[model samples]
Target: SMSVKKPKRDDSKDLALCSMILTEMETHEDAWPFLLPVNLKLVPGYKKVIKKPMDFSTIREKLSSGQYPNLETFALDVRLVFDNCETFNEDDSDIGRAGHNMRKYFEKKWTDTFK
Candidate 1:
């Protein structure tokens, strides 16, 4: 299939660059202070053999539904709120640092790991 997830794409310069970075991250596990909490928590998802692919699909569907109120409900979309709370973060400013942090961490994390 002509998709980014195809095997050829994973070993491209970008992927090798990423792997070099992760190898470094493993080496520099000692450097914790510079890394943010979110960075530390983030990890890449590698595709591996699963005897039953159905299990993966089931969990993905469950999480995506966001109706976790009941056994049938798989997610957390029940709460109704104010219009200003569109971002869904209470007691927080409209200005967002997280978006920048996420992108920053993405590059920094791989770079950090590469080191």
Candidate 2:
């Protein structure tokens, strides 16, 4: 008797793509503020305002460990970083401006590559 093989979906492509995008984002000029988690000591109210704090390093680590099941999930975390920034800083503030710049770049890159 011949056994039937189940076809499984491959996620390597998406993983690679996400990793590439993340690398580019990390090197962006406006990526400084998002490189790591915000210093709670410096900004004591950060934790109170932003329930979920996301950053480039965390995303990168998650990607490496296969935490993201798909591109959408990966994008969610990426957006979170900007969302948190926007919530914490004023639009005219340096960090806020950087977040907007980084978001614009990421959105364009995402659309160009995956849309």
Candidate 3:
């Protein structure tokens, strides 16, 4: 059976973590990637985005202006990138590994930060 399980969903926890993340960031644009260190700097496509010029500045400015409601909403929106990826049975594909690492980053962040 091809069934999917619901991943952890915590608005309060996500809010708390996301809030702290906003304050701790050197570049607000980095928050777009949940401030995941390895996933942001060491992962694919992220380093290049940070290096080149893009619409990140505009996004940061727009997001900080309270236009999109709360951080949870923003977090969910950002998470949609991975949530929309093709689901696989194993962590063999690049996208699958990317999703796996991304989830692990959040898991560790929630665990280590709260501990």
* lDDT of every predicted structure (CA atoms): 0.30, 0.91, 0.46
Better of 2 and 3 by lDDT: 2
RMSD of each: 16.2, 4.1, 11.6
lDDT of 1 by residue, 1-115 (tens): 4555634422224334443433443244332322222222342221231211212123233334542333212111111111112232233443233323333444575445333
- Against the true structure, candidate 3 reaches a TM-score of 0.38
Q: List the residue pairs that clash in candidate 2.
A: none
TM-score of 2: 0.88
Off by over 4 Å in 1: 1-11, 31-106, 109-115
Task: Give the least accurate 10-residue stretch of model 2, judged by summed lDDT.
Answer: 1-10
Best by lDDT: 2
Give residue 81's error in model 2 in angstroms. 0.4
- lDDT string, candidate 2, 20-114, tens digits: 89999999988999999888779879978889999999999998997988899999999999999998899999989999999999999999987
